[PDB]
């Protein structure tokens, strides 16, 4: 003669959602590998990175000689047009972060010294890159030095 429970809640999860949240999430967490970053969200987060960069530099101690830059697309595009172009991006939050030297190139060139080759090998570029970065991991004042 006795009757059991019905429970309205679970009916919300079945009907309003095509997935079932009262299922053990640890099965997918431990076995199935995750999913990467998608579209229509990276543009906002990069523009969030655009804003925190343009406010980092108005705070951090800027060398005002010649370093024209555009912070567009998440990279400050640190460049003096004679010798230097690099893309530096904060790895984390605004205030206390070091930097990274995401791209490196040199604007100095000659057309007849080398044999039609880039006079510099990329191994020095990396050799500079970590030398910047180990001293960026030495956490000095970033802009003046």
């Amino acid at each position: 003669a006795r009757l059991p429970s019905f429970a309205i809640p679970y009916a919300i999860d079945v009907l309003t959602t095509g997935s079932y949240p009262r299922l053990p999430t640890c099965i997918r967490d431990k076995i199935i590998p995750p999913d990467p970053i998608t579209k229509i969200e990276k543009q906002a987060t990069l523009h969030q990175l655009n804003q925190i960069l343009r406010h980092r530099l108005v705070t951090t101690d800027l060398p005002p000689q010649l370093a024209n830059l555009t912070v567009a697309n998440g990279r400050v595009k640190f460049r003096v047009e004679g010798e230097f172009e690099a893309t530096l991006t904060v790895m984390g939050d605004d205030p206390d972060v070091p930097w990274r030297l995401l791209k490196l190139e040199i604007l100095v060139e000659d057309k007849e010294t080398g044999d039609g080759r880039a006079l510099v090998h990329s191994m020095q570029i990396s050799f500079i890159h970590q030398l910047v970065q180990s001293r960026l991991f030495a956490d000095e004042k970033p802009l003046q030095d």
């Binding site: 010294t113 080398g114 044999d115 080759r117 006079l119 050799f127 030398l131 180990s134 001293r135």
Partner: peptide, 25 residues
């Protein structure tokens, strides 16, 4: 189922740079 065959003087004066700017930790 290479070299420009001028790397020798490039590296030589780069060697002069290593005894003036050494790598720094």
């Amino acid at each position: 189922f290479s070299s420009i065959f001028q790397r020798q003087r490039v590296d030589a004066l780069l060697l002069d740079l290593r005894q003036k700017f050494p790598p720094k930790f």
